[PDB]
């Protein structure tokens, strides 16, 4: 729909200096979407926007820790 | 009757001022203190690369 | 509100005794029955080694360092799970 | 009772000025010295 | 719903507490709980200042609601005047078992 | 960077820092004026043998003493808050860069497109090359495109730090578990320095920040070469 | 006469230009001749001699206004002593530099500073006012 | 304030002694530590 | 007798004297720590070691100067000596609990000394922020000893506050309303209210830090859902009131000193001074996040804390102008205590105005955690609290001791200190504007000149401190006994003579109501 | 001889033994936390109890036995107790602040939700409701005790005070049982931290308040109180109502709203 | 408030009270010099005659000193006031501080 | 001889204060004009002049040729 | 129980010069000595523990 992605756009849900929840929300939305799409046999390519946003915003170590915990079964957010 | 200040005030003022100036000038100029003043108008720039 | 009771006239021990035995202790007895009724152990949930729980940044100053102060083996897992 | 009056309402003696000087030297001198000797202690450790 | 058994102050207060209680019943104030009411404070009608010794500090609030209090020793003898407003005070010494 | 014998702020590298300099000028004039007026009145009150020691009525002069300072405060607060809200307006960044504080160095992640990240350590004094600045140079600079709005996101992986660049008017604390955002825009190419600004242990004094601002095309090629 | 510590609750004498008539006389005990002078004071003051007037004054008061208000040389002592102890401070600083401080870093060496200064000009440190603004890049010299 | 003359006058010489002892009580112990810093560190 | 009098005291004057001796000894410790700071910074490079030993010294410097020098001297020392005398009371309300407030301080100080002796010290800043102060980055006993030192100092001052509030409300002459008590008494009452409300919150926060460090709580640890910034809120909810606690009794003494050496019977604008101290005390509880403008706070919150912080300048300016108006028309007596007070007025005003600069959160982005803040607060603390302490000490030393100081020596002492503290701190404004961080053991070379001058200034203040000890020795050595004191009609604390008897006001004052 | 009504207290060793007991308890906690040893702490706890015992013993001697508590002295003690309670309110306020800060903005580590993922809160309608009725009931019975005392009724004062203490003990035993049964612990993140530190300090204050009520019970048995002079009882009742109100805030905030 | 004339008249009346006592003389002068003014000659005249009725020569001299002091640096005021008082000074035999040498430091 | 004229005798302190508070104020307006002109205006003009014809690419090329950059030779 | 407050009032008001904390008799002295001995001995022990903890241990 809209490539030439440069970086994550301003998001009125998260307008202040603390962007922690912006990273978290896009991480959740990406993996929630990917679970939905790979369940119903659809295409994860529709989840790509959320993936781009959380990759731009989230520290590598947060993503890595959250990915490890998803694999371990200890991720405390709902997906 | 003249008190301590009438008798000694001039001497104390004169010697205190002279001593203070002499020892701060000496400390400031003679013992290797690096004041690091501005290079502006003082330092000739020199090739570094 | 005003409760729904309704006395006054001047102040007294007899009134506060009436409230102690007529309202306060009956309520304790009722809540004691309500409780001694929903009591009896509850089935413990699967252990999941969540990293925000079972925190250990320094051993506890008692026991083996790994048991909380009022550790209950039935419902308090260790960082490695329930005790066997 | 207790002693009253100048030099008597204090926990230290001012009856002799040189003994006083020694006591005041020890008193203020020990407080001023202590941080230097703690620094020394921390440097000598590691 | 009837019993006693709790002592009263009349029965059981002791020491200074009892002294104050008994003096208050008489309308007396040997321990200075109340503020004295001023007289007109002229030399003919000076404020009378009780004391158990030969001098007592007076504080003079010269006018109502002045925040500044004027303090001075009042001595046995002829009435003295507040050094700010001039109102007169005279010491009346006594013994204390008044 | 600062220079020897400097009295005031580093020259502004960003428009917001420009604004802060003029607001500081507006405010320091008031500081000087009030402090000098108090010193002078101290001298007016203290330089006469004339006396007047009876009770003085206060309420008229206390009106002056409250209303005039209230007006002065409003004269400071109005441009102050204007800058605050302007600093907060939406700006649309072209680039996001993260920095993570550590004991004792900074790491940087540029993950809009590729997995680019590296560590950035103070150059030790014994390894400075001639003309380099003691305690300020780093081994890997934060290269960035000039004349573009950049979102910096700041966090920490251990204790508190704080990521500062005085010539851009930047200081954002680095707090573990938190992602703080600031914006950066340099009017000029060059090298802009800062230092860790929250006490963080043994080498707090020795984990500096160096931004290297260059044209976009140089930044793109540098980025590709850092993969 | 002789003021005692045990008199603190009694009205006392003070010389203050804002309290010209103190609460007591400076001298309360009178010799035979001073008693006779106080009696003479009840008659016309025109019949008192100058010395008798002065003696009455000095019975009532300790110092005159001119005496109690006089200026002193104390400032010389204060300013001079303060400068002495400030001077003494520089002795401590000299001691510290000789015995406590080691060499400063090699970046203060004259050649290092010359090269650093050029590198600062090459990166246009503070080019609007603070540093490079003061360099003439056209004439290769510090602006006049 | 007014006061009595000193009951135990402290002459200029006595003041110089008191001042000197006081200053040495602050300076000597700190001076000894700072003089020997290198010994403590480079240890 | 000695043990009964000085270890078992129930006497407000002797306990005041104990606090003054304690605070003076702490002052020497805090001075030595401040000279180690300035020796480290007095030339470029490393003198002592890296930032750990350096910030152990900085941390202890602040705790000693605040909790063991200023608060004990102003509140325990001058408050205990003067408040009961100024209201004609026979002692404090709780004379025996008063003695425990005193004796909790040597153990508190011992815990702080122990902190710096064990492991590598608590190199945290006096703010003790986690995670640096947590059990991973500051493993071992030092930070827990600091926490416990603060607990004991906190209990001491909370009980002291209860004592002062009760004494001042309950033990005045029955005709004296609160609006007939002297300004220093007001200043102690307000300070005590601030202590009562703020210290329990500190106690909560540092107890949370203690359990995070030792009981596996995670109040401030994100891994458990905690937040380091919560600690900062709890700490500064106390810490801003704390700086007004440090200065309010100073304001009270300055009012008395300026009135007295102006030859006035009363300060200008008494009810405005009361209003101003109450307003400062109240506003002092709603401004704390001006210590957090760089933590990542929302813009509207920054706008509020900017504005609330500035408004404190209005009642504060009423007090400055009312001191000027007290001087106006005075028969000015240029005593050494008057000089301390005049220096206070000017230096406090300088530091207040740099506070106003900092209140602008947009400029504070650049100034925060730099030496501009250090300059702001040393103008209000080392040239405000310290100058009010020295003014009150030389003014009331004859009352406490019965002996006079040598006024020429005391003026010399003032002159040296005034030069020393301004050479120390004025250049730190330049260092802060040009970007030198706080809590640094070493600095980029450009900062050398101002750090050199600042360190030289600190040595001039050392010489003043050594001279102060000698001056006190000279007074007790010569034994010039006080005779008469002017203006007792409006300075009740002098009216029982110098020193006053052990028991005063055994017979209370007579005050009628009219 | 004084002619004011205030109490000049005899020189006393208990301020010093109390201060030293604070040094021993804090250095003792340090030794326990870091040097595996309880010795200093047990000495400090012992000297603290001895100090409190003798200090408050002496206050009873000075008042009931020596008559030094004039109305003016009593009025000072009333202010002192109110101010002390105010400081304790502000102490709990810090823990309530921590609780709301963490629960109103739950971080990602928790699951970004409150209660955190993996936390199973107690049912507020079970033993926590029972505890609420117990403390509220004890506020009624202590008011009965107060009115009986003012009406000169020794027997009903003792009966009502005994009931109040029994309820305080019941609350403490119930809370101890709930602590043991709770499936979460103090190490269970900020949920367990806020829960146990806030309710635990509250439980400590219930034990303190119950001990104070028991002191009043034995003084009453020894006839110390008159129908008009009984400030130790009033202070213990004020402290007891404070403990009740803190519980009500904990119940609403942590047990109910936070569940 | 009151005119200058009313102020002055009140103070003349104060010192002119025939049986004014020593305490009232001192209270009057010590209060008067607190104001932002040098007292008019007619006030000083009444105070000096009060001194005379109280047989107190020294206080009359002291009152002249304090007039001079209240003028501060305005050196023209005291010689004018002495000029205006000379008939009274001559009538009562009051010597000035200068005539007594009491202006010497 | 001639009599001395009557001088002003009342309100000398108030008159002195009035005169000097106005002079105090006049300083501040006179200072404010100086500080605005010597500092604040000078700064606005220095920034406006600097950027008026500023060529950022040219600045960059000078820096690049001087060798100062890691990313650009 | 019987009201024996009057007996205790006589005891604690006896004109014997004793401070209130010792006026109950020899048991007060014992309890005072136990308390002060534990405090002072405990404080010396705390200093020893500081000295031990101030140095690293193998
Ligand atoms: C006695 C101590 C004291 C006092 C009184 C003050 C008073 C003030 N302080 Fe200060 N402050 C500290 C001690 C004090 N401070 C300390 C220790 C710190 C740092 C803590 C740390 O980080 O360790 C600090 C930190 C600090 C900061 C944080 C800076 C940072 O960390 O980035 C700020 C910013 O808001 C600030 C502002 C002010 C203000 C506005 C006042 C005002 O209350 C001043 C008001 C007074 C005046 C303004 C002067 C007189 C007024 C007039 C003559 C009238 C005319 C004036 C006007 C019209 C403006 N202070
Ligand atoms: C009252 C508080 C107080 C006082 C008086 C001082 C006094 C001094 N301080 Fe202090 N300082 C702090 C509180 C204070 N400081 C605080 C809170 C910090 C921040 C800590 C942190 O960052 O965490 C700090 C930080 C600080 C720093 C910054 C450290 C850094 O960021 O790395 C520096 C550096 O120069 C400094 C230097 C000095 C010096 C040279 C003095 C000298 O002026 C000292 C001179 C001596 C005196 C002023 C006299 C001492 C008083 C007496 C001797 C009592 C006499 C007793 C009687 C008369 C009864 N201080
Ligand atoms: C029944 C209620 C009363 C509790 C009695 C238990 C002893 C504690 C004494 C009371 C102190 C209260 C607050 C102390 C903080 C922690 C205690 C919290 C209450 C409690 O008892 O929490 C228990 C943990 O105790 C633990 O860690 C034990 C830790 C024990 C040592 C605490 C040491 C810390 C003391 C710090 C005090 C500082 C005070 C400063 C005062 C301020 C000065 C102004 C919970 O047990 P759990 O096994 O984790 O979960 C139960 C699972 N089945
Ligand atoms: C267990 C781990 C360590 C914790 C230690 C705490 C342990 C328990 C302590 C329980 C408190 C017991 C208090 C007993 C006080 C008895 C003395 C008393 O009650 O004294 C009364 C005065 O009140 C007074 O001092 C009022 C005195 C105020 C007492 C305040 C008590 C609360 C103290 C709490 C300590 C807080 C700890 C907080 C920790 C966060 C005496 O006057 P009356 O009663 O009028 O009698 C006079 C009449 O007889 C005359 O007719
Ligand atoms: C920050 C506050 C302190 C700053 C200012 C201190 C001023 C110093 C005063 C003198 O201090 C002494 O200086 C000596 C040297 O002058 C040292 O002797 C050392 O040096 C001598 C000469 O090398 C030897 O004789 C000695 O044995 C050796 O201890 C000595 O130990 C030290 O006490
Ligand atoms: Cu990282 Cu300071
Ligand atoms: Cu603040
Ligand atoms: Mg910071
Ligand atoms: Na250094
Ligand atoms: Na009651
Ligand atoms: Zn009066």
Map out the domains of chain G as residue ranges.
1-144
Give the number of residues written for chain F.
Answer: 227
Cα distance from D9 to chain M (closest Cα, Å)?
Answer: 21
- Is I413 assigned a catalytic role? no
Closest CB from J117, J120, J126 relative to C38:
J126
Chain J residue with Cα closest to M11: J65
Phi, psi of F172 (to 5 degrees): -130, 120
Please say whether the beta carbons of I401 and I475 come within 8 A. Answer: yes
Residue recorded with tokens 């002796």: I117
Q: Where are the alpha helices (DSSP H) in G6-73?
A: 32-40, 50-60, 65-68
Provide the CA I495 distance to its chain's centre, in angstroms.
Answer: 28
Structure tokens at F224: 């590709």
Q: Where are the alpha helices (DSSP H) in chain A?
A: 20-39, 48-57, 60-72
What is the whole-number distance in angstroms between the Cα of residue J218 and the centre of ligand 4?
13
Report the sign of the C-alpha dihedral through residues I350, I353, I357, I358, in that order. Answer: positive
Q: Per the residue annotation, which of I290, I302, I395, I429 is the catalytic one?
A: I290
Closest CB from A20, A24, A76 relative to J116:
A76
Domain-ending residue, one of F62, F91, F120: F91
Please say whether the beta carbons of I248 and I241 come within 8 A. Answer: no
B29 touches G at CB < 8 Å: no
Query: Can you tell me whether residue J126 is helix, strand or coil?
Result: coil
Cα angle B7, B11, B15 (rounded to 5 degrees) comes to: 160
Each residue of C70-81: b (16+ CB within 10 Å) or e?
Answer: beeeebbbbeee
Same domain as F102, residue F50: no
- Is I461 assigned a catalytic role? no
Chain F residue with Cα closest to K73: F49
Q: How far apart are CA F79 and CA L59, in angstroms?
A: 32
Of I192, I193, I188, I196, the residue nearest I82 (C-alpha): I188
What is the whole-number distance in angstroms between the Cα of residue I443 and the centre of ligand 8?
18
Q: How far apart are CA I395 and CA I400, in angstroms?
A: 10
Q: Where are the alpha helices (DSSP H) in I64-141?
A: 71, 80-86, 95-103, 105-117
Question: For the CA atoms of chain M, what is the radius of gyration?
Answer: 20
- Domain residues for the domain of L23 are 2-73
Task: Kindly give, in sequence order, each residue whose CB lies less than 8 Å from that of residue K87, ignoring residues fewer than 6 positions away.
Answer: none
Structure tokens at I288: 């704390």
Q: How far apart are CA J258 and CA I225, in angstroms?
A: 15
Residue I216 backbone class (left: φ over 0; alpha: ψ -120 to 50; beta: rest): left
Residue recorded with tokens 């976009």: F216
Query: Can you tell me whether residue I484 is helix, strand or coil?
Result: coil
Extract the annotated binding site of F for Cu cation.
161, 196, 198, 200, 204, 207
What is the whole-number distance in angstroms between the Cα of residue J10 and the centre of ligand 4?
19
Ligand 2 in contact with I61 (CB < 6 A)? yes
Q: How far apart are CA I123 and CA F201, in angstroms?
A: 7
Of J95, J109, C54, the residue nearest I208 (C-alpha): J95
M39 touches J at CB < 8 Å: yes
Of C18, I372, E84, I471, the residue nearest F8 (C-alpha): I372
Of J92, J22, J24, the residue nearest I151 (C-alpha): J22
Q: Determine how many CB atoms are found less than 10 A away from the CB of residue G144.
A: 6
Counting Cβ atoms within 10 Å, is residue M15 exposed (0-12), middle (13-18) or buried (19+)?
Answer: exposed
What is the whole-number distance in angstroms between the Cα of residue I248 and the centre of ligand 2?
18
Which chain I residues have a beta carbon less than 8 Å from that of A18? 296
Residue E89, H or E segment: strand E88-93
- The residues in I 17-76 lying below 8 A from H, measured between CB atoms, are 32, 35, 39, 47-49
Cα distance from A7 to chain C (closest Cα, Å)?
Answer: 31
- Is I156 assigned a catalytic role? yes
Please say whether the beta carbons of I268 and I254 come within 8 A. Answer: no
Q: Mind giving me the DSSP string for E7-47? A: PPHHHH--HHHHHHHHHHHTT--TT--SPPPP----SSSPE
Ligand 2 atom, smallest distance to I246 CA: 1
Query: Can you tell me whether residue I67 is helix, strand or coil?
Result: helix
- Identify the chains in contact with L, defined as 3+ C-beta pairs within 8 A: F, G, I, K
| Long-range contacts formed by K85-93: CB under 8 A, 24+ apart | K85/K41, K85/K44, K85/K45, K85/K48, K88/K45, K88/K48, K88/K49, K89/K48, K92/G45, K92/G46, K92/K48, K92/K49, K92/K52, K92/K60, K93/G44, K93/G45, K93/G46, K93/G47, K93/G48
Chain I residue with Cα closest to D25: I469
Ligand 5 in contact with H30 (CB < 6 A)? yes
E81 touches K at CB < 8 Å: yes
Domain-ending residue, one of F57, F91, F125: F91
Cα angle G79, G84, G87 (rounded to 5 degrees) comes to: 125
First-residue to last-residue Cα distance in chain A: 25
Cα distance from I508 to chain E (closest Cα, Å)?
Answer: 7
Q: Does domain I2-514 match CATH 3.90.420.10?
A: no
Of I333, I259, I354, G18, the residue nearest K29 (C-alpha): G18
What is the whole-number distance in angstroms between the Cα of residue I223 and the centre of ligand 5?
52
Q: How far apart are CA F61 and CA F67, in angstroms?
A: 10
- Is I288 assigned a catalytic role? no
Q: Per the residue annotation, which of I31, I91, I443, I450 is the catalytic one?
A: I91
Please say whether the beta carbons of G129 and L43 come within 8 A. Answer: yes
Q: Per the residue annotation, which of I54, I126, I396, I447 is the catalytic one?
A: I126
CA–CA distance from I451 to each of G92, G106, I37, I173, I368 (Å)? 17, 18, 11, 54, 19
Of F124, F118, F123, the residue nearest F106 (C-alpha): F118
Extract the annotated binding site of F.
161, 196, 198, 200, 204, 207
Please say whether the beta carbons of K54 and K24 come within 8 A. Answer: no
Please say whether the beta carbons of E96 and J1 come within 8 A. Answer: yes
Residue F14, H or E segment: none
- Is I236 assigned a catalytic role? no
Q: How far apart are CA I127 and CA I199, in angstroms?
A: 14
Task: Kindly give, in sequence order, each residue whose CB lies less than 8 Å from that of residue G60, ignoring residues fewer than 6 positions away.
Answer: G25, G26, G27, K56, K58, K59, K62
- Is I319 assigned a catalytic role? yes
Cβ–Cβ of C57/I215 closer than 8 Å? no
Looking at residue F126, which CATH number applies to its domain?
A: 2.60.40.420
CA–CA distance from I208 to each of B46, J98, J197 (Å)? 57, 9, 8
Q: Per the residue annotation, which of I31, I309, I316, I335 is the catalytic one?
A: I316
The greatest distance separating any two alpha carbons of chain I, rounded to the nearest whole angstrom, comes to: 72
The greatest distance separating any two alpha carbons of chain D, rounded to the nearest whole angstrom, comes to: 55
Q: Per the residue annotation, which of I156, I401, I461, I504 is the catalytic one?
A: I156
Task: Kindly give, in sequence order, each residue whose CB lies less than 8 Å from that of residue I76, ignoring residues fewer than 6 positions away.
Answer: I15, I16, I18, I19, I22, I23, I101, I102, I105, I160
Closest CB from E5, E8, E20 relative to J5:
E20
Same domain as F193, residue F100: yes
- Domain residues for the domain of F137 are 92-227
Count of domains in chain L? 1
Provide the CA B35 distance to its chain's centre, in angstroms.
Answer: 13
* Residue to substitute in J47, J59, J211 for testing ligand 4 pocket (most ligand atoms within 8 angstroms of CB): J59
Query: Can you tell me whether residue G43 is helix, strand or coil?
Result: coil
Q: Determine how many CB atoms are found less than 10 A away from the CB of residue M30.
A: 10
Query: Can you tell me whether residue F5 is helix, strand or coil?
Result: coil
Q: How far apart are CA A27 and CA A62, in angstroms?
A: 10
Provide the CA L71 distance to its chain's centre, in angstroms.
Answer: 42
Half-sphere exposure of E7 (CA within 13 A, CB side): 22
Structure tokens at F134: 């003691």
Residue G69, H or E segment: none
Resolution in A: 1.9
Ligand 1 atom, smallest distance to I321 CA: 53
- Is I291 assigned a catalytic role? yes
Cα distance from M54 to chain I (closest Cα, Å)?
Answer: 4
Structure tokens at L13: 């302190």
Residue ranges of domains in chain E: 1-98
Question: For the CA atoms of chain A, what is the radius of gyration?
Answer: 13
Cα distance from F15 to chain A (closest Cα, Å)?
Answer: 20
Omega into F104 within 30° of 0, i.e. cis?
Answer: yes
């Amino acid at each position: 729909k809209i490539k030439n992605y440069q970086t994550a756009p301003f998001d009125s849900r998260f307008p202040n200096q603390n962007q922690t929840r912006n990273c978290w929300q896009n991480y959740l939305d990406f993996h929630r979407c990917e679970k939905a799409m790979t369940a119903k046999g659809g295409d994860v390519s529709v989840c790509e926007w959320y993936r781009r946003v959380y990759k731009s915003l989230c520290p590598i170590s947060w993503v890595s820790t959250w990915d490890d915990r998803r694999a371990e079964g200890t991720f405390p957010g709902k997906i | 009757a003249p008190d301590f200040h009438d008798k000694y005030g001039n001497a104390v003022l004169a010697s205190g001022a002279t001593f203070c100036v002499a020892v701060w000038v000496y400390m400031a100029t003679q013992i290797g203190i690096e004041w690091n003043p501005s290079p502006v108008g003082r330092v000739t720039p020199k090739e570094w690369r | 509100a005003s409760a729904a009771k309704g006395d006054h006239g001047g102040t007294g021990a007899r009134t506060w005794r009436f409230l102690t035995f007529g309202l306060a202790l009956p309520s304790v007895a009722l809540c004691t029955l309500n409780s001694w009724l929903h009591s009896g152990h509850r089935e413990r949930p699967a252990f999941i080694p969540y990293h925000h729980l079972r925190i250990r940044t320094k051993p506890f100053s008692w026991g083996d360092g790994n048991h909380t102060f009022f550790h209950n083996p039935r419902v308090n897992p260790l960082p490695t799970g329930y005790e066997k | 009772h207790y002693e009253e009056g100048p030099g008597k309402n204090i926990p230290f003696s001012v009856e002799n000025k040189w003994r006083l000087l020694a006591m005041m030297t020890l008193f203020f001198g020990s407080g001023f010295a202590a941080p230097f000797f703690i620094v020394r202690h921390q440097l000598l450790k590691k | 719903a009837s019993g006693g058994g709790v002592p009263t102050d009349e029965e059981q207060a002791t020491g200074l507490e009892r002294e104050v209680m008994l003096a208050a019943r008489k309308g007396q104030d040997p321990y200075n709980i109340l503020a004295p009411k001023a007289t007109s404070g002229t030399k003919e009608d000076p404020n009378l200042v009780p004391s158990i010794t030969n001098k007592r500090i007076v504080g003079c609030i010269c006018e109502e609601d002045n925040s500044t209090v004027i303090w001075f020793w009042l001595h046995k003898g002829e009435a003295q005047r507040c050094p700010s407003c001039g109102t007169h005070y005279k010491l009346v010494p006594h013994q204390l078992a008044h | 960077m600062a220079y020897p014998m400097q009295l005031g702020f580093q020259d502004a590298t960003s428009p917001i820092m420009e604004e802060l300099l003029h607001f500081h000028d507006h405010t320091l004039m008031i500081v000087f004026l009030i402090s000098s007026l108090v010193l002078y009145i101290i001298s007016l009150m203290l330089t006469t043998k004339l006396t007047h020691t009876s009770t003085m009525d206060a309420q008229e002069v206390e009106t002056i003493w409250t209303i005039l300072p209230a007006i002065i405060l409003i004269l400071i607060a109005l441009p102050s808050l204007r800058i605050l809200y302007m600093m907060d307006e939406i700006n649309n960044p072209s680039l996001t860069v993260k920095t993570m504080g550590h004991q004792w160095y900074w790491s940087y992640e540029y993950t809009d497109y590729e997995d680019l990240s590296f560590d950035s350590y103070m150059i030790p004094t014994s390894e400075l090359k001639p003309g380099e600045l003691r305690l300020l140079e780093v081994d890997n600079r934060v290269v960035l495109p000039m004349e573009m709005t950049i979102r910096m996101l700041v966090s920490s992986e251990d204790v508190l730090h704080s990521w500062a660049v005085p010539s851009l008017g930047l200081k954002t604390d680095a707090i573990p578990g938190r992602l703080n955002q600031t914006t950066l825009m340099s009017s000029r190419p060059g090298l802009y320095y800062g230092q860790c600004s929250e006490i963080c242990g043994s080498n707090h004094s020795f984990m500096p920040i160096v931004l290297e601002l260059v044209p976009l095309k140089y930044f793109e090629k540098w980025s590709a070469s850092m993969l | 006469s002789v003021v005692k510590s045990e008199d603190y609750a009694l009205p006392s004498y003070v010389d203050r230009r804002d309290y010209p008539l103190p609460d007591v006389a400076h001298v309360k005990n009178l010799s035979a001749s001073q008693k006779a002078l106080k009696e003479k004071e009840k008659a016309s003051w025109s019949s008192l001699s100058i010395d008798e007037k002065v003696e009455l004054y000095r019975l009532k008061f300790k110092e005159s206004f001119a005496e109690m208000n006089r200026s002193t040389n104390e400032w010389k002592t204060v300013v001079g002593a303060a400068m002495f102890f400030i001077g003494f401070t520089a002795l401590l600083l000299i001691w510290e530099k000789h015995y406590v401080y080691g060499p400063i870093p090699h970046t203060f060496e004259e050649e290092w500073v010359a090269k650093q200064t050029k590198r600062m000009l090459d990166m246009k440190v503070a080019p609007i006012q603070g540093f490079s603004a003061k360099w003439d890049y056209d004439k290769n010299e510090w602006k006049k | 304030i007014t006061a009595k003359p000193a009951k135990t006058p402290t002459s200029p010489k006595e003041q110089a002694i008191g001042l000197s002892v006081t200053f040495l009580s602050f300076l000597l112990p700190a001076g000894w530590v700072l003089y020997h810093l290198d010994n403590y560190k480079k240890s | 007798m000695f043990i009964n009098r000085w270890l078992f005291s129930t006497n407000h004057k002797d306990i005041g004297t104990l606090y003054l001796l304690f605070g003076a000894w702490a002052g020497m410790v805090g001075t030595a720590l401040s000279l180690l700071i300035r020796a480290e910074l007095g030339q470029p490079g490393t003198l002592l070691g890296d930032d750990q030993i350096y910030n152990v010294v900085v941390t202890a410097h602040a705790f000693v100067m605040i909790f063991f020098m200023v608060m004990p001297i102003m509140i325990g020392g001058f408050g205990n000596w003067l408040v009961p005398l100024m209201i004609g009371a026979p002692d404090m309300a709780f004379p025996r609990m008063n003695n425990m407030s005193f004796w909790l301080l040597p153990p508190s100080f011992l815990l702080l000394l122990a902190s710096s002796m064990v492991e590598a010290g608590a190199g945290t800043g006096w703010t003790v922020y986690p995670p640096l102060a947590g059990n991973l980055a500051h493993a071992g006993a030092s930070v827990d000893l600091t926490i416990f030192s603060l607990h004991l100092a906190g209990v001491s001052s909370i009980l002291g506050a209860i004592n002062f509030i009760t004494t001042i409300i309950n033990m005045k002459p029955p005709a004296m309303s609160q609006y007939q008590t002297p300004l220093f008494v007001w200043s102690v009452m307000i300070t005590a209210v601030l202590l009562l409300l703020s210290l329990p919150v500190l106690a909560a926060g540092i107890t949370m830090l203690l359990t995070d460090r030792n009981l596996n709580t995670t109040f401030f640890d994100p891994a458990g859902g905690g937040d380091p910034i919560l600690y900062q809120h709890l700490f500064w909810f106390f810490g801003h009131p704390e700086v007004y606690i440090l200065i309010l009794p100073g304001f009270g003494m300055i009012s008395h000193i300026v009135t007295y050496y102006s030859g006035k019977k009363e300060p200008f604008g008494y009810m405005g001074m009361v209003w101003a101290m109450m307003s400062i005390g109240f506003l002092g509880f709603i401004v704390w996040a001006h210590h957090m403008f760089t933590v990542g706070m929302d813009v509207d919150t920054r706008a509020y804390f900017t504005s609330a912080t500035m408004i404190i300048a209005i009642p504060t300016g009423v007090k400055v102008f009312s001191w000027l108006a007290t001087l106006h028309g005075g028969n000015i007596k240029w005593s050494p205590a008057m000089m301390w007070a005049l220096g206070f007025i000017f230096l406090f005003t300088v530091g207040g105005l740099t506070g106003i600069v900092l209140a602008n959160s947009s400029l504070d982005i650049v100034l925060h955690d730099t030496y501009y803040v250090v300059a702001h607060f040393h103008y209000v603390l080392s040239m405000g609290a310290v100058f009010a302490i020295m003014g009150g000490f030389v003014h009331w030393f004859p009352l406490f001791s019965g002996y006079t100081l040598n006024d020429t020596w005391a003026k010399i002492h003032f002159a040296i200190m005034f030069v020393g503290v301004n050479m120390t701190f004025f250049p730190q404004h330049f260092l802060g504007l040009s970007g030198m961080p706080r809590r640094y053991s070493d600095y980029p070379d450009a900062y050398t000149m101002w750090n050199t001058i600042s360190s030289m200034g600190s040595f001039i203040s050392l010489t003043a401190v050594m001279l102060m000890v000698f001056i006190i020795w000279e007074a007790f050595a010569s034994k010039r006994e006080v005779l008469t004191v002017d203006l007792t009609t409006t300075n009740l604390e002098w009216l029982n003579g110098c020193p006053p008897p052990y028991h005063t006001f055994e017979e209370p004052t007579y005050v009628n109501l009219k | 001889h004084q002619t004011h009504a205030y109490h000049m207290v005899n020189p006393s060793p208990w301020p010093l033994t109390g201060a030293l007991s604070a040094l021993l308890m804090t250095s003792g906690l340090t030794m326990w936390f870091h040097f595996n040893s309880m010795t200093l702490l047990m000495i400090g706890l012992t000297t603290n109890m001895l100090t409190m015992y003798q200090w408050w013993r002496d206050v009873i001697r000075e008042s009931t036995f020596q008559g030094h508590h004039t109305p003016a002295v009593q009025k000072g003690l009333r202010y002192g107790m109110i101010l002390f309670i105010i400081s304790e309110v502000l102490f709990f306020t810090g823990f309530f602040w921590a609780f709301y800060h963490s629960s109103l903005a739950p971080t990602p580590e928790l699951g970004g939700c409150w209660p955190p993922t993996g936390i199973h809160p107690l049912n507020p309608l079970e033993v926590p409701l029972l505890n609420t009725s117990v403390l509220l009931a004890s506020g009624v019975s202590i008011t009965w005790a107060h009115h009986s005392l003012m009406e000169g009724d020794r027997k009903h004062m003792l009966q009502a005070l005994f009931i109040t203490i029994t309820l305080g003990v019941y609350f403490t035993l119930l809370q101890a049982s709930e602590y043991y049964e709770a499936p979460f612990t103090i190490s269970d993140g900020v949920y367990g931290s806020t829960f146990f530190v806030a309710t635990g300090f509250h439980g400590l204050h219930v034990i303190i308040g119950s001990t104070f009520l028991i002191v009043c019970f034995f003084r009453q048995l020894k006839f110390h109180f008159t129908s008009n002079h009984h400030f130790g009882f009033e202070a213990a009742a004020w402290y007891w109502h404070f403990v009740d109100v803190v519980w009500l805030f904990l119940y609403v905030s942590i047990y109910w709203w936070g569940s | 408030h009151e005119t200058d004339e009313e102020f002055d008249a009140r103070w003349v009346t104060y010192f002119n009270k025939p049986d004014i006592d020593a305490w009232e003389l001192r209270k009057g002068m010590n209060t008067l010099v607190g104001y932002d003014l040098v007292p008019e000659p007619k006030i000083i005249d009444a105070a000096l005659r009060a001194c005379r009725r109280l047989n107190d020569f020294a206080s009359a001299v002291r009152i002249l000193e304090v007039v001079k002091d209240k003028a501060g640096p305005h050196k023209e005021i005291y010689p004018y006031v002495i000029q205006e008082l000379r008939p009274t000074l001559n009538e009562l035999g009051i010597s000035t501080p200068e005539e007594l040498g009491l202006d010497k430091v | 001889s001639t009599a001395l004229a009557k001088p002003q005798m009342r309100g000398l302190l108030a008159r002195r204060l009035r005169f000097h508070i106005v002079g105090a104020f006049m300083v501040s307006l006179g200072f404010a004009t100086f500080y605005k002109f010597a500092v604040a205006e000078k700064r606005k003009k220095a920034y406006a002049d600097f950027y008026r014809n500023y060529d950022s690419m040219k600045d960059f090329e000078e820096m690049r040729k001087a060798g100062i950059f890691q990313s650009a030779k | 129980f019987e009201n024996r407050v009057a007996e205790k009032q006589k005891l604690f008001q006896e004109d014997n010069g004793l401070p209130v904390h010792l006026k109950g008799g020899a048991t007060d002295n014992i309890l005072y000595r136990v308390t002060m001995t534990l405090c002072l001995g405990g404080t010396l022990y705390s200093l020893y523990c500081l000295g031990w903890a101030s140095f690293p241990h193998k």
